[PDB]
Amino acid sequence: AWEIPRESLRLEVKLGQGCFGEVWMGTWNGTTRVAIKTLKPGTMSPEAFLQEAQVMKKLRHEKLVQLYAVVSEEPIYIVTEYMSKGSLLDFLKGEMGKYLRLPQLVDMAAQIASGMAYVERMNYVHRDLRAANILVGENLVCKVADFGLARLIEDNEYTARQGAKFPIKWTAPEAALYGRFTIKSDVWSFGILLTELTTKGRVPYPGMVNREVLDQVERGYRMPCPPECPESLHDLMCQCWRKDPEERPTFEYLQAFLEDYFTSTEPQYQPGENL
């Protein structure tokens, strides 16, 4: 019903290409600038996507990238609000990243937490929360994107949480072994997302490989405090990385913590070369 015609969409410039798809800046009717994400055929069933898209329509928040329209027929097109600065991973690794400091990054972290807090309130699970799926816009605005599409993926390796098409490094152990995805498992991913911010886009568990990570995490290995990062922020990461999901923090707590970080947690902060 929210379906639209393909001819309505013009794909102008390719922002990115991914494992299951690519993303384009475009025009929706010659009037509306939009982001168009396209999935390769055989990624997910169109009925399943439409069923899920109903839920995606339900989810509305200012820190969530808002769905505009879809094309059910393969290749499936997802049409959403355009974000000017592209991916968070793109932004951090970009020229602007050098000018980013801890207050900016914590603020960016806070916005993500605010969107997830809404998702937490809505009893929903993202299943793949990381910098790649964060979108940045003008004035350092960060919004969470691509929620709910992880479940719909039909890839055989991906289903078993295996095969390097899977973001195992961001994935909580209980959700990796047994595939139990909760808002709590998202909190684990968020802690990993915090690493991406404070390292300005470095891949998690550097030097380790996807096979290596799960056993290391299982035996209690956790990522060390990043350079120029306050131990207090790193402690927050560790809370997110607790083995028992129940003792991991809520997104509501996270949002307030990040928002009040420089008055309540680190009032005596001084900027460094990186942070």
Partner: peptide, 4 residues
């Protein structure tokens, strides 16, 4: 997913 879209941005490997």
């Amino acid at each position: 997913a879209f941005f490997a």
